[PDB]
Amino acid sequence: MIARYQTPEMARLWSEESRYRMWARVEAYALEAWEALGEVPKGLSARLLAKLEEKPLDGAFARRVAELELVAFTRALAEWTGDEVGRYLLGLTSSDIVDTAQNALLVEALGLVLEELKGVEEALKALALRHKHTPAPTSFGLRFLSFLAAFQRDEERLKRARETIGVAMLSGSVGNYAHVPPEVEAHVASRLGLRPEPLSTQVVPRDRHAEVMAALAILGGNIERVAVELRLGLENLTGVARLLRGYLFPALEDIALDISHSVERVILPDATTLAHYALRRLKGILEGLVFLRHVDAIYARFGL
Template sequence: MNLRNIPNLLNFVLTVKLITVKYDSCDRWRTVIERYTLPEMGNLWTDAYKFKTWLQVEIAVCEAQAELGYIPPEAVAEIKAKANFDPQRILEIEAEVRHDVIAFLTNVNEYVGDAGRYIHLGMTSSDVLDTALALQMVASLDLILQRVGDLIEVIRAKAREHKNTIMIGRSHGIHAEPITFGFKLAGWLAEVLRGQKRLQALRETVAVGQISGAVGTYANIEPRVEALACQKLGLKPDVASTQVISRDIHAEYVQQLALLAASIERFAVEIRNLQKTDVLEVEEFFSKGQKGSSAMPHKRNPIRSERLTGMARMVRSYAVAAVENVALWHERDISHSSVERVMLPDACILTHFMLVEITDLIKNLLVYPENMARNMNCYGGVVFSQKVMLALIEKGLRREDAYAIVQQNAHAAWNQENGNFRELIRNDVRVQELLSPAELDACFDPQQHLSHLNEVYARLDI
């Protein structure tokens, strides 16, 4: 496509592979493809919503100015009654003036008339931009926290269901010792609960505004206006803004989203590993009529977990961009602006989608206890080697000697078609001299490994 042949760039639709970028009067350039944008979050990052928050900031400042006697109360009433904006018109003005806030103010004043002279008094563009951006970030975080709460309840319910579903625990990808699937989920739940606490603290951190004027010195607007306006908006004044709110706050915001995405990725990777054909202990729900492969009709692929893994990479990549934004020149530059126009909508929209996706995935996850039992008992219970070793030590055998006896029998069973560690160790005369058949059988009881798990469950209300 030759863009020079398109007479009106504001109305074109550019299609690249499967990604469609559209323009309309309420939604300027979409930064995340619609496939992964859920309306409740996507609506917070449209141009229409952004301009709405800009207007909220301007009106809050006007109200504060009036309360302090700087502008007539009747002017504020007129501003509130008449103020409006047209996203299309703002873009038309911006095409000429090359300044989005000036274009916005010009359009608002077209609606307000003479009272518009009281709008933006003593303010700088970043007073509007950064304070309004805080409103968007808080609103987005509230949605994310709501979805985190949903995920917590779904994991907790699934963990309760499988508190006693025995499976093998793995380290380095190799069979280790018995656990339960509920215990595995308990670890996920604890991680999400920690994330929830971090996000709740983050909400307070990012809920800051600034109405401090050029370079932040309050030369043309006093701090009392800032305090009143921020209070009306549900924000706190920044402690020491320059001409912008320092970007370490925004970097922390994106980093926390990246950390949450990393947790979701961990769960997704675990599901993918447990769904392997030769493991098949859990499986993503496969709906009627769903297809797994265009070539192989038998395939049931973990596509949702794979999707989440890929999305986590995207969110994580924005954490780097967010940190790069911290080092601005002097009291401000706008090198951060172009990054944030893509980074913040993308990070919020993707994290929100990931939460909804992983919640539904876990809620409908298929769990196969029979396969878990089969996998745990391969090679004749070799995973109970530590219990046998400890039993021999309790009978007075040196640890090194006990280890050598158990390892010899375990390795003899390992990767053998009919390998049976339990039979081999039972027939070892060195073991027979120290352990009775009943004592040896007790070593192979998986319940011994689960006796303290109720303490963990109680901590998490499972």
């Protein structure tokens, strides 16, 4: 995604470095649970976490991994902490590590989109109150309340998408816990603020990703609506809405299937970052913006 349509928070969240740090946390929390089960020496996971706190994974780690090209990553992780750790990375698959980390990242990304949505929601509330008794014959305020009601529906949809995607898969080769006790997954889930994936195969099911992307595409349409109604930088918000519709189509195709889903490396980071960018741009525009006898009853439905 080109820098003009990026937020600093999304650029950091979706960087190489941030993915490796999340991978490392999954590995460390898994080791911690194996330790409770007698399968890794006491103190090995505390040592990896202490060392990550002291020397966070950065560009030099990421370049170093791009050379050895999860074997490359685990070698680079053991080498970059100078450590035993190598032998104990035991039953988990690549997909367990990578899909769990991506879920964690997507939970964070949706938290950023919700934070900005709340800003747009607050600006529309304020505009709707300010213009509650402004004549237009109707209240000019009702228009902003219509936007608010749509964004509140988007909030509900984005919170449900966040609950659906917030799962940890640490289930081993075919997803039946033969090589990794369910306790490992339960522990890693808990440490990441996720819940255990109640039924995984080799992968997390992609109806979960599709609900996230569909929530973003519906949010884009509501951003578009405000922008088209305001035109009383809106080529920008309509542009983002078209990309969000485009990005949804590969996620809908990914439902049926392994890894045939390039696709997620592009669409999840790009749609979450365009959503964040667009709501921030829309908040700025709303902050700098300019027969009635049932208006109070209508406002009351929104506690206004």
